[PDB]
Amino acid sequence: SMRSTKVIHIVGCHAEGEVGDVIVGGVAPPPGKTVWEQSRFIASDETLRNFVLNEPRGGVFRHVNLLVPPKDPRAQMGFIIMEPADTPPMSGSNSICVSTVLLDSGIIPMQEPVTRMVLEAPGGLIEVEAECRNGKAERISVRNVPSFADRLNASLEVGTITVDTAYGGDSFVIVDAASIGMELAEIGVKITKAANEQLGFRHPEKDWNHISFCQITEPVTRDGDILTGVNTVAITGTGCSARMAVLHAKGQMKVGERFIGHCRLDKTLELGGKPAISPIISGRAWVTGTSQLMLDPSDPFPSGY
Amino acid sequence: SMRSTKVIHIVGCHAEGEVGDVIVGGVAPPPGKTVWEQSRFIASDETLRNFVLNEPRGGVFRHVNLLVPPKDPRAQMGFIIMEPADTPPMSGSNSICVSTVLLDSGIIPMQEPVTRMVLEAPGGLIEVEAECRNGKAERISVRNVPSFADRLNASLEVGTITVDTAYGGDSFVIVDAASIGMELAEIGVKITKAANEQLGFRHPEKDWNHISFCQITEPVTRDGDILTGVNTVAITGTGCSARMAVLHAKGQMKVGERFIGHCRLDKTLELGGKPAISPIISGRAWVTGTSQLMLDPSDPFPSGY
Numbered sequence A, B: 001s002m003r004s005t006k007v008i009h010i011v012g013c014h015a016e017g018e019v020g021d022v023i024v025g026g027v028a029p030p031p032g033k034t035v036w037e038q039s040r041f042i043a044s045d046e047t048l049r050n051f052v053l054n055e056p057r058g059g060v061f062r063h064v065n066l067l068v069p070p071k072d073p074r075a076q077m078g079f080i081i082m083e084p085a086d087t088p089p090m091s092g093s094n095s096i097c098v099s100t101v102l103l104d105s106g107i108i109p110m111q112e113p114v115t116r117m118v119l120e121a122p123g124g125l126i127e128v129e130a131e132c133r134n135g136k137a138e139r140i141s142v143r144n145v146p147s148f149a150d151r152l153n154a155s156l157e158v159g160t161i162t163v164d165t166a167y168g169g170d171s172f173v174i175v176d177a178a179s180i181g182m183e184l185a186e187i188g189v190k191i192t193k194a195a196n197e198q199l200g201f202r203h204p205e206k207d208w209n210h211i212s213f214c215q216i217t218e219p220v221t222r223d224g225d226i227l228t229g230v231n232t233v234a235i236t237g238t239g240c241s242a243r244m245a246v247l248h249a250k251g252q253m254k255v256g257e258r259f260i261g262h263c264r265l266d267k268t269l270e271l272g273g274k275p276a277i278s279p280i281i282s283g284r285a286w287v288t289g290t291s292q293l294m295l296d297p298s299d300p301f302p303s304g305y
Helices: A035-045 A047-053 A092-104 A184-198 A237-249 B035-045 B047-053 B092-104 B184-198 B237-249
Strands: A007-015 A021-025 A064-068 A077-082 A114-121 A124-133 A136-143 A148-157 A160-167 A171-176 A213-217 A221-223 A226-228 A231-234 A258-260 A263-271 A274-283 A285-294 B007-015 B021-025 B064-068 B077-082 B114-121 B124-133 B136-143 B148-157 B160-167 B171-176 B213-217 B221-223 B226-228 B231-234 B258-260 B263-271 B274-283 B285-294
Touching: A007 A047, A007 A092, A021 A092, A035 A047, A035 A064, A035 A077, A047 A064, A047 A077, A064 A092, A077 A092, A092 A114, A092 A124, A092 A136, A092 A237, A092 A274, A092 A285, A148 A184, A148 A237, A148 A274, A160 A184, A160 A237, A171 A184, A171 A237, A184 A213, A184 A231, A213 A237, A231 A237, A237 A258, A237 A263, A237 A274, B007 B047, B007 B092, B021 B092, B035 B047, B035 B064, B035 B077, B047 B064, B047 B077, B064 B092, B077 B092, B092 B114, B092 B124, B092 B136, B092 B237, B092 B274, B092 B285, B148 B184, B148 B237, B148 B274, B160 B184, B160 B237, B171 B184, B171 B237, B184 B213, B184 B231, B213 B237, B231 B237, B237 B258, B237 B263, B237 B274
Parallel strands: A021 A064, A077 A114, A171 A213, A226 A258, B021 B064, B077 B114, B171 B213, B226 B258
Antiparallel strands: A007 A021, A007 A285, A064 A077, A114 A124, A124 A136, A136 A274, A148 A160, A160 A171, A213 A231, A221 A226, A258 A263, A263 A274, A285 B285, B007 B021, B007 B285, B064 B077, B114 B124, B124 B136, B136 B274, B148 B160, B160 B171, B213 B231, B221 B226, B258 B263, B263 B274
């Protein structure tokens, strides 16, 4: 015989090779008056995160998204993103997976050639356009939350270097590799540490008040209205949104252009009192299965490992 | 809508913190006249392995076991072990998971306080005794396949060092750390490489003719009839079985004693023409859920990544 203290129902999914599994049942919505507050519970409490992210049920590269009811009536569904490192306001790949699961598994009805949805992420509403064909949500385009550069060309003591800070659904300190090197993971974290110490970060209308990661980049190359940039992140759709905000701020990217790390700088906005951009992130996703997660009452690793 | 080219039904499971998920349906038994030949198909063909082991469905630490019909009539069930690195003749933790899934999910009936089963692994029959209480297979004890040392104190050029080689369901070159160091993963693989080059390995009655891994150890400590030994493996129940075979060969472990890396040296045997031991490996396991794995026909990563 088996025993389980809970049963969590998941539709597995990945977007362009990034896992973004989706909890569709078995989890009541977290306490909180807003989707933001609900995500803060999930981040603080950690029970759901550890259970679905850690071995023996998850893995270091797993991301999991929890569907919850929309709090903003303009939205059809809310979701909370659980990544390995944090529980962020938004995530490109995960919003693509959530959209794909909602449409491919029939939770939201599908129109062809295009289905439009409004979803509510912790960081605000996102507009989704899905290209749908023969029953499949083939490609999802998401208008990400307002994204922006916080500091440009800020000096930071680590050598002594220059960095940008930016937000595109999560927060980054962004550094050119050559200005230091071309190991990276190790340097990346000290830089993030230092940036939090000396620059900080505060989102104008959301309570995200730290820098999560460091993005290390090499110079973009331009081909017409497409920019291509090599980068890595020391501990990506929020990465690209944040980087696009910096490139735009420094004049190296204009409205209407695309960035490939697809991302598109759709328009400018004002946020706080300062310039921001509206990024559109797009990608394809595929359902990878269904699962029912369980926990034996005698399992000595209730939070996994 | 969703599409899938296949549906594979799994009962998830871990033994003492090692994942050993079990395929219970959706996969026909592989071609082959023996469970050994079927495992060789699985190793060569790789389709099933890549599909269940790789992201986005698996992860680097996942092991998966495929139930198949017994070919030897003395067995109640056969199984093929799929680890990240290889498809081995036997595995302690995986045989414990297979036993636990068979009993806890009701495939084989449970008697209390003890259920006995005979299973067929690729490397031969294993005898299983499960301590069962209130419906739960609490602890499994497995008589592993005959295990043995192949070479003792063999010289190997790498510095110039001394090693033992041994088999306990998989094959190991075993080296004392201090005799080199106390990085390890990197040295481990060259040592394995060198051992394959200069010593080789050939199992007397099975077609396992190479050394899979290097085990790096520190000296055992003894407390009564319990030996405790620190070790690591550069790329564990087969590890402990192999190590016990060497300790026994060198006189540092006697019949009836236990080794904690639980393992027990139950008795001696002859294999080929040379001494071997019969290890009993024991541990607890817990079911972690059920899943139905799927593959969209348009997913460009049919073998995962």
